[PDB]
Ligand binder design. Structure first.
Ligand SMILES: Nc1ncnc2c1ncn2[C@@H]1O[C@H](COP(=O)(O)OP(N)(=O)O)[C@@H](O)[C@H]1O
Ligand SMILES: Nc1ncnc2c1ncn2[C@@H]1O[C@H](COP(=O)(O)OP(N)(=O)O)[C@@H](O)[C@H]1O
Ligand SMILES: [Mg+2]
Ligand SMILES: [Mg+2]
Lengths: 355, 355
């Protein structure tokens, strides 16, 4: 029985797979053919069908898990294609599946069409927290799992630096997926969802597709990297003529996101790339501001950002780092994690012994 | 010299004009002709040029101000047209002008092209607070200036009801204009800007114009009233298949604003009206959520919403009322004010004796 953990989100399915590398002589001796087939297929491909991807660089090697040593693999595909995944699961076969995320409930009955499968639904919260704390504890192959942007306010000196979470409490976790969930973690056994916002990664992707006609997350980011958001946004200096000193709002700060788009002549001259960047900047800064308010409310100074809105998205990471540092005068630290999209899937996998 | 107060914002100029009604026999006797001309023009028209509007229903009658009795009028026009206002001000003429808002600084030199004019810039904060507290103190011609939506969670019983602010401290003021400013008022002499968000009225209007091609705020609201935002938004039940019980998120709550627009087939079937409503709902709920976080942070349970994003916008008012009541289990009260766009202009006017 292959050991999987699965996080079925609104947009992406994330899968963690533990591959045994201590398979002795007898264990292999007629491992069921389909079991060998699965392992070979999963380890010999980096793309699965048309939409499946193994994030090879994230792989954890020579991990000891449940008394076996092995490699932990990370795989993702769109939730839209889960029916294909399930259909191919009814092709050749015994497996226990730990699943979390909203789709663990929505697609419960579908997974049960696989005859040789028991589905154990696990709570999203327990999985995220257990997964995050586990990965940081085993490290990223000896390297830090957690990092921050040192001197996030000065672009000439700003750089990614490892961050130590050996005593990770308290912690604010900001999960940016389709929507945004915010958790306060006070201990391994004590955490609560603080709030959320519906303005998250799917807002960025949805709006960006409406405004620019982009057809992928990566294309949207590529467009944004070429844009100038100030063409769409109304800035403090557009309103004051300069800075607002009395409240320390610099002239370059955004006063009204997309606020220049109320003028027809500006709508007619703005580029797609400008609109992609303004969308990214708008969604990201709003999340940063909500994150700061929760942290102040919860009296927590370490804010960790996870979820896949931030994968291959350095712009948003730097925006978040700069914003928390600026507005808090250095009291708040924006923290990031190498495996940020996969913590739910790992936590699911870790719930395996309790079944 | 006519008594004006002016609030020059990023989008609208708001003007409060005090018309004396106790003009005796000698006072009129050769009041300078241009002074009579101004008064006649202002009181005999409700539309001024192409873009100026007197909000006649807001007029305060038989007010005693600065020892004179008179009527307080409320007038608005787009900031875009301020050069026209100024040009016509150089036509016929002595006047002292109290002005607040960012444009008091940006257009300082322009106002000084009017030879017989001294411009006194006043701080936006002092004006808003003084203006709000003044109007509520004199009442809306005997009626409450402040109101709330009773039973905001049940549409069959939900209705506008007067609210008493005789002891208005403490107070959270959420000013929704082009952007959003949030103030905590602890006393008449003690208040601070808590935070803000750049996702405000200009975001709604700008995005709505990009997405739907609407050419006015009113048209945008009209489109939104005919729409179904759930066509653009991804809901909790789209992700879970139903409700999320563990954290009390109902199936109908929005999980990801515009989150369904990541799918090409849904982008192709959505209407303009759906997109207008989703824009309104998205911006409004985000403001409600930010408002709730500040209030919890500031330990204030009365939240007053002002600014012109809410004029002729019952939908957004009810959304705000419902959200604060729901999420706070009745601890927080969303409050609204009849003169909500004009408090800065009134506070400016009231600074007149100090010059
Ligand atoms: N390949 C990708 N496809 C779709 N969305 C992607 C993506 N890579 C990154 N993203 C972003 O990640 C977000 C989903 O993040 P995730 O953390 O997996 O959310 P969820 N709700 O599916 O569980 C999307 O909204 C998008 O902004
Ligand atoms: N006639 C109108 N024209 C333009 N915007 C209008 C409007 N009536 C209401 N609005 C809304 O009010 C917002 C401006 O509110 P206001 O409080 O006067 O902002 P500001 N920054 O100009 O001082 C606009 O963004 C729009 O959403
Ligand atoms: Mg998720
Ligand atoms: Mg204003």
């Amino acid at each position: 029985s292959p050991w999987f953990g699965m996080d079925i989100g609104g947009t992406l399915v994330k899968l963690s797979y533990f591959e045994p590398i201590d398979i002795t002589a007898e264990e292999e001796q007629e491992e069921v053919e389909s079991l060998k087939s699965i392992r070979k297929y999963l380890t010999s491909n980096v793309a699965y069908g048309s939409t499946g991807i193994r994030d090879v660089h994230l792989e954890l090697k020579d991990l000891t898990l449940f008394g076996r040593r092995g490699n932990l693999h990370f795989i993702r595909f769109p939730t839209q294609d889960l029916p294909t995944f399930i259909q191919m699961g009814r092709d050749k076969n015994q497996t226990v599946l730990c699943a979390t995320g909203g789709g663990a409930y929505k697609f419960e009955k579908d997974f049960r069409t696989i005859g040789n499968l028991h589905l154990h639904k696990l709570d999203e919260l327990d999985c995220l927290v257990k997964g995050l704390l586990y990965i940081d504890s085993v490290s990223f192959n000896g390297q830090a799992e957690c990092y921050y942007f040192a001197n996030a306010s000065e672009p000439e000196r700003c750089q990614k630096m490892p961050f130590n979470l050996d005593d990770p409490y308290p912690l604010l976790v900001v999960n940016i997926g389709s929507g945004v969930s915010i958790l306060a973690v006070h201990s391994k056994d004590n955490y609560k969802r603080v709030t959320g916002t519906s303005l998250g990664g799917g807002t960025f992707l949805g709006l960006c597709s409406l405004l620019t006609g982009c057809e992928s997350f990566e294309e949207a980011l590529e467009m944004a990297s070429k844009g100038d958001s100030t063409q769409a946004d109304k800035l403090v200096r557009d309103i004051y003529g300069g800075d607002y000193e009395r409240f320390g709002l610099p002239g370059w700060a955004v006063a009204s996101s997309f606020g220049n788009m109320i003028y027809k002549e500006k709508r007619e001259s703005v580029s797609k790339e400008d609109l992609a960047r303004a969308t990214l900047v708008t969604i990201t800064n709003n999340i940063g501001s909500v994150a700061r308010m929760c942290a102040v409310n919860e009296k927590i100074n370490r804010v960790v950002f996870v979820g896949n809105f931030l994968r291959v998205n350095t712009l948003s990471m730097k925006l978040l780092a700069y914003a928390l540092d600026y507005w808090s005068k250095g009291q708040l630290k924006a923290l990031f994690l190498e495996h940020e999209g996969y913590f739910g899937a790992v936590g699911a996998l870790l719930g395996l012994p309790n079944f």
